[PDB]
């Protein structure tokens with residue numbers, strides 16, 4: 001029996017309570033031979049019948065229709081959602097068990113593949129993570145805040161930098177090149193975000209969202225199976241005595257079952273006329289191809305047939321219930337038998353058993369400390385700007401000298417955040433652009449005299465140098481701090497999720513370079529304080545010294561460290577400078593110059609003043625107002641000095657950095673739009 005197009009569409013469509021784009025699903029069926037359905041799971045522990053049997057039933061439908069089914073065994077996602085005491089070591093071991101059961105349960109594995117999140121992410125770190133960051137960059141915190149029910153959590157201002165998990169799950173859909181997203185209706189909001197992110201990255205074809213039904217819980221109150229009630233659902237380990245007890249006492253309204261209005265968040269809701277006994281009949285028996293119930297002689301061909309018989313009292317409740325008990329025990333026995341016989345398999349279940357010992361609530365919840373650096377070491381982040389002010393550059397130069405002198409055999413590292421800044425959506429939000437901006441502005445800061453002892457390093461190098469350990473720590477820092485906390489650092493509001501990831505990345509970078517002190521500029525704001533806080537106030541914070549080189553307007557008129565000949569020339573021209581005045585932006589720049597050098601000298605000619613030198617700031621302010629220093633004589637001297645100092649940095653603009661300057665000024669053209 002080779003199926004025609006219609007027959008396959010009918011069977012594949014059958015798997016989903018909803019199907020985002022039936023039209024899209026039918027294109028795939030007609031066009032593509034090995035369609036990728038995907039699903040994923042946190043190996044949380046004991047396996048409930050929905051996941052054991054009902055999932056097998058649906059995978060088998062997918063594969064029969066001519067699909068390939070890829071399972072994302074999401075070890076880290078369970079870890080991020082605190083699933084098993086936060087002990088990852090052999091959550092693997094659980095995962096291994098879950099697969100062993102599916103085999104016994106009847107999943108046809110010929111076209112099913114299992115991948116392990118840990119293995120596959122680590123292996124393609126750059127590909128995976130860069131996207132995980134891009135999705136958070138192009139999306140509002142609000143939107144990702146809304147994906148909270150895929151993890152069984154509430155958006156309640158009580159989410160734990162666990163706005164990362166969605167970004168990652170969303171990424172998985174593209175990483176694994178999913179054609180169809182065949183996960184539960186819970187996960188709806190993440191899959192939605194993937195479809196949305198398709199319109200952004202341009203990708204023409206969106207993933208089809210074929211969301212499966214959420215099995216009802218066995219008691220009146222509950223819509224799904226919960227963890228704190230073993231009797232809410234049948235588990236694959238239950239003895240036939242267990243299966244009896246649990247279904248016998250199960251809620252069982254005599255009301256015809258009719259499909260529920262599709263909620264937005266996907267999550268189910270309990271009606272008083274929700275009948276789980278019937279829901280098990282529809283999902284675990286009748287959904288199997290050949291399957292049909294048989295009570296008291298008569299065999300009900302459709303589920304619908306059985307349902308009528310019950311509600312018209314042809315079949316008793318006690319009879320209906322007694323049938324499901326027989327019927328379910330039939331589905332489990334094969335699995336039970338297997339683990340009673342296969343020694344390797346029993347070992348694996350007993351292995352789950354030797355984890356069961358005691359439990360959470362809470363001798364559990366595992367995370368990870370750090371250790372203190374042997375000698376002093378400060379790190380500082382290069383402002384992610386297309387034009388960095390001169391005031392700022394000179395500020396971060398002096399902090400460096402000051403720190404070196406006061407910790408003579410310590411160390412100083414300058415970090416170029418070429419990952420974080422893209423996540424934050426700095427500048428144009430493009431990667432090539434931001435990395436060019438950083439590489440230039442750094443190059444000049446050295447030309448303006450950044451010490452050689454400073455170790456310059458890009459985040460790319462730090463991460464891809466030591467990948468796992470990095471992100472594992474990011475994950476770990478992430479778990480301990482609440483979202484609401486991280487948002488404080490940006491003054492209580494964030495522009496996008498990427499900024500929540502950027503703050504996390506810095507703390508992580510500080511820990512990895514084994515930093516003692518974090519150096520901050522005005523552009524850093526309060527972000528770097530996170531490092532100090534996360535280290536129980538161990539890491540000290542040092543603030544740069546700025547506000548010596550003002551804006552040139554009177555109370556782009558501000559000296560940036562990439563000003564060329566023309567720029568320095570004209571910017572001064574516009575600088576304010578009233579006559580007989582002793583307080584203005586040209587003087588503030590001149591006094592700074594005089595301080596740094598140790599004596600300013602205007603170079604006149606005789607009669608028209610004569611030349612003069614000033615080596616104090618009181619002796620200049622006098623001469624500017626009540627005095628014989630005209631705006632032009634001072635401005636002339638300043639401009640020469642500003643140029644003369646920059647000379648070294650400027651040769652780079654029409655030389656080595658010219659290459660990248662092209663790409664920078666092209667960025668500036670997009671921001672004008």
Ligand SMILES: N[C@H](CO)Cc1ccc(O)cc1
Nearest residue numbers: 040041042074077150169172
């Ligand atoms: N969040 C899902 C259920 O808790 C687990 C998951 C599924 C698919 C993924 O690509 C990632 C995680």
